[PDB]
């Protein structure tokens, strides 16, 4: 069972949010596939890690209200770097 939920990360006092992402695809069916931005790695002791509500394999649907379903990896990274100390992520998990 999957679920879309919201996760806010605050990197105050940390070097970065701690997420590494990649463009990926999963088969939503049985005869179709969906593409998107997925969390490929999480940095230990980073906000993403300490949060505990973000998992490797989760897909990022939006960032601070911006749809990133079809964004390039670099575009999402730029968006994150343009943010202050916080980013609100719409996450699809499980």
């Amino acid at each position: 069972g999957e679920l879309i939920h919201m996760v806010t990360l605050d990197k105050t006092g940390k070097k970065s949010f701690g997420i590494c992402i990649v463009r990926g695809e999963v088969k939503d069916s049985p005869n179709t596939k969906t593409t998107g931005i997925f969390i490929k790695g999480i940095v230990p002791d980073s906000p993403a890690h300490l949060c505990g509500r973000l998992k490797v394999g989760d897909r990022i649907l939006s960032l601070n209200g911006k749809d990133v379903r079809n964004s390039t990896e670099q575009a999402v990274i730029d968006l994150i770097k343009e943010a202050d100390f916080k980013i609100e992520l719409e996450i699809q998990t499980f």
């Binding site: 970065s16 949010f17 701690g18 997420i19 590494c20 992402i21 990649v22 490929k40 790695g41 940095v43 990896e73 670099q74 999402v76 990274i77 994150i80 770097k81």
Partner: peptide, 5 residues
């Protein structure tokens, strides 16, 4: 690993 923030 590229694309981390």
């Amino acid at each position: 690993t590229e694309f981390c923030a």
